[PDB]
């Protein structure tokens, strides 16, 4: 019993974090086999940041300009190259702690664990979701860029996020491990801002199923709805449309609880229209949208 | 920016988790140096559980009755003994991954990270608080007992909790690493239940300071209060009394934000009396009490 925002165990990623320094800039890097991945911003200076030409900045560097430290061990850089917004530093040592891994890009509405790091040292681990507007509501301080987000499946780490920056509303933007940004953001100084966001409907319904599995049933009702009537209500409350694929994905949780997906939708409609009347669900007084159907099944089953 | 329920990186504890089997019962154990720690319930059978005499149960066992597996490696048990509600299995191999560690017992209102494990394999990591009534609101399924809770400071793991059982309200009870239960709970079958709980006032005030550090200021006011007037209001809302030591502990956050502790108390009084009027603090619509002043400083500073 119980339901918590649970992250993956972080040890496999801890053994990959290193510190990268270029000039006076230090940030985190990810050491896998004999390559260290880090934000290419490490080669910028403070006044380089209005419109840096990274190809020019990089051609003016050599290997000896990059100091890579793994714990108390310095790694010799023997090659450097750019790929989109990340830098690939080839080092003379393969990381003996490299896990099985993949570089995956995730979709809005998917969740992942973040290992927040400073100066190559892990500080904390938490769960995040990629918002519909491609930002993440992280927890990061200066020095955290290069920290990574990941999921783990049967001992294979799928890296999906590298941290780059903080937008004016305090939410966070970054890239995939190929250096391609999530969202319409750039690694230069602009007035760029998070665009409008929406609530991840399928995740809210998954979390209502978690609540039923855990004994909160007060929000259930005998009603049902059609998918189109529900989606009219969703549109009105800035919720994403629910598709038939979402309905199919909720099938296992529906079968476990005996509550048809469109019956749960009728409950969610009532909650949007009426609020909670001073009650809570799974210890929250808001509708939570950062758990996927898979997160619920992984944490709740049986 | 940002504020999340953040756990400690779990890798140092992952390298200590093993599986212990006795008869048909399997659960988790903690391998440090050449000892494996686990709940003594592992030696029970299903009908042993009304009033087991653990000293009798244990004297009928030998070393070969305990199967300890670390990954795919079997550890030979060469001694066994009981200490309160935990079992100490001496094995013929010292764990090469043992971290610097301590066994500390924590106080109600303190937080810790939990590494939930099944069959000796880590599954997820999350943050918890010891409630005033000595339960924890965890997330645990059958097979999780022996999972541990811990804090980490400068590479030293202070273990504070071993998981034993789930109470009827779905909250969790366990012991310290010396086998002594937190709270008035026993490892036998009874009608034992969580006692009445209260809200951890000093933590709520720490979290209001986190919110101010992160730009939520709507709940501030020009008022102040005395400690006695505040504590009259606390008593009325089932909040714990605030002591002068709590005020002193909040001093650094008060100095960082410029908001005197008793001024923040006046805000908390207004929030208890009026509610939030449809607003949120740090993404919550309830007053959060599971962050200590230290948690806030660690996550927010600067
Ligand atoms: C450090 S987290 C980093 O990689 C980075 C990436 C992209 C953009 C920036 C940046 O613009 O930093 C300032 C503080 C806004 C100049 C940093
Ligand atoms: C397994 S998590 C374990 O250690 C344990 C400890 C103490 C009490 C129990 C228990 O009573 O289990 C049942 C399921 C209530 C019989 C289990």
């Amino acid at each position: 019993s119980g339901f918590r925002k649970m992250a993956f165990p972080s040890g496999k990623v801890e053994g990959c974090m290193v510190q990268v320094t270029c000039g006076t800039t230090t940030l985190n890097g990810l050491w896998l086999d004999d390559v260290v991945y880090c934000p290419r911003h490490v080669i910028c200076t403070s006044e380089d940041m209005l419109n840096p030409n990274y190809e020019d900045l990089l051609i003016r560097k050599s290997n000896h300009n990059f100091l890579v430290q793994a714990g108390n061990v310095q790694l010799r850089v023997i090659g450097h190259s750019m790929q989109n917004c990340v830098l690939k530093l080839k080092v003379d040592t393969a990381n003996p702690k490299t896990p099985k891994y993949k570089f995956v890009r995730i979709q809005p509405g998917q969740t992942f664990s973040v290992l927040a790091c400073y100066n190559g040292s892990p500080s904390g681990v938490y769960q995040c979701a990629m918002r519909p507007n491609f930002t993440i509501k992280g927890s990061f301080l200066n020095g955290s860029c290069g920290s990574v987000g990941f999921n783990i499946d049967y001992d294979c780490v799928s890296f999906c996020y590298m941290h780059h920056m903080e937008l004016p509303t305090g939410v966070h933007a970054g890239t995939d491990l190929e250096g391609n940004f999530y969202g319409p953001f750039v690694d230069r100084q602009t007035a760029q801002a998070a665009g409008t966001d929406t609530t991840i409907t399928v995740n809210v319904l998954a979390w209502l199923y978690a609540a039923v599995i855990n004994g909160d049933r007060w929000f259930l009702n005998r009603f049902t709805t059609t998918l189109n009537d529900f989606n009219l209500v969703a549109m009105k409350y800035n919720y994403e449309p629910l598709t038939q694929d979402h309905v199919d994905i909720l099938g296992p949780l529906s079968a476990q609880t005996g509550i048809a997906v469109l019956d749960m939708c009728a409950s969610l409609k009532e909650l949007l229209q009426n609020g909670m009347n001073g009650r809570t669900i799974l210890g929250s007084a808001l509708l939570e949208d950062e758990f996927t159907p898979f997160d619920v099944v992984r944490q709740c089953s049986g």
Side-chain angles (χ1 to χ4, degrees), chain A:
Chain A
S1 294
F3 203 71
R4 290 273 193 188
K5 279 254 163 77
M6 176 177 315
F8 285 103
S10 60
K12 284 180 176 71
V13 179
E14 291 170 52
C16 300
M17 300 310 305
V18 299
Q19 163 171 223
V20 181
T21 298
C22 186
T24 59
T25 303
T26 297
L27 45 63
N28 306 281
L30 179 75
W31 178 25
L32 302 163
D33 303 317
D34 65 346
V35 179
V36 169
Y37 302 83
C38 72
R40 73 184 176 166
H41 166 83
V42 72
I43 68 180
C44 287
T45 62
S46 47
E47 73 295 311
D48 262 317
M49 270 276 151
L50 187 281
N51 253 298
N53 185 292
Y54 285 103
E55 214 197 323
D56 277 354
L57 294 178
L58 191 55
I59 190 63
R60 299 168 182 151
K61 300 289 185 210
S62 35
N63 294 327
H64 71 91
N65 292 145
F66 299 92
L67 177 59
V68 180
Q69 308 165 246
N72 305 140
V73 161
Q74 178 177 331
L75 304 183
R76 187 195 167 224
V77 173
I78 61 167
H80 55 279
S81 66
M82 191 132 57
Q83 169 184 128
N84 305 303
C85 302
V86 297
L87 220 56
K88 294 173 73 188
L89 303 178
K90 181 178 207 212
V91 289
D92 65 356
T93 305
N95 183 358
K97 299 176 190 161
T98 306
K100 281 38 209 173
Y101 71 95
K102 305 204 284 217
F103 286 174
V104 308
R105 185 179 175 98
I106 60 169
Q107 292 285 316
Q110 291 193 268
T111 54
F112 56 99
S113 300
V114 169
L115 180 67
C117 289
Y118 298 90
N119 303 109
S121 189
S123 176
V125 66
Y126 57 88
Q127 260 320 76
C128 265
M130 179 56 68
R131 301 302 314 169
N133 70 2
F134 288 102
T135 64
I136 73 166
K137 297 175 181 255
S139 175
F140 287 119
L141 298 178
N142 289 337
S144 55
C145 49
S147 299
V148 299
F150 55 98
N151 284 283
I152 304 184
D153 187 65
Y154 294 112
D155 293 323
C156 178
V157 179
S158 290
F159 294 105
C160 58
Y161 178 85
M162 187 168 264
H163 187 50
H164 288 243
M165 55 200 207
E166 188 168 287
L167 296 169
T169 48
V171 308
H172 296 109
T175 64
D176 63 24
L177 273 293
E178 322 285 357
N180 300 297
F181 264 92
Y182 281 104
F185 308 112
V186 295
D187 55 355
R188 56 186 162 89
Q189 176 69 40
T190 73
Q192 58 192 331
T196 63
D197 206 21
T198 55
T199 297
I200 303 154
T201 309
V202 66
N203 290 2
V204 174
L205 294 167
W207 172 83
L208 292 178
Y209 279 109
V212 176
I213 290 174
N214 280 274
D216 287 331
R217 310 177 54 86
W218 65 258
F219 51 85
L220 298 175
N221 60 46
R222 58 185 208 281
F223 293 131
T224 192
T225 186
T226 63
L227 196 51
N228 305 313
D229 288 339
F230 175 74
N231 275 334
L232 291 172
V233 167
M235 189 159 315
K236 185 206 165 15
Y237 287 89
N238 192 36
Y239 267 56
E240 298 200 307
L242 194 71
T243 69
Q244 179 63 43
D245 193 54
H246 289 146
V247 172
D248 295 340
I249 283 161
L250 291 163
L253 289 172
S254 174
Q256 187 182 333
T257 59
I259 300 174
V261 177
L262 296 175
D263 276 18
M264 191 69 83
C265 290
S267 287
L268 176 51
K269 176 192 300 173
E270 292 310 307
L271 288 169
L272 290 171
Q273 285 169 350
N274 304 338
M276 281 183 206
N277 291 119
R279 295 167 287 198
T280 56
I281 303 176
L282 283 173
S284 183
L286 298 175
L287 303 170
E288 304 286 322
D289 84 340
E290 294 200 359
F291 299 91
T292 65
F294 179 77
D295 294 345
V296 175
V297 170
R298 153 185 179 239
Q299 198 177 150
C300 285
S301 290

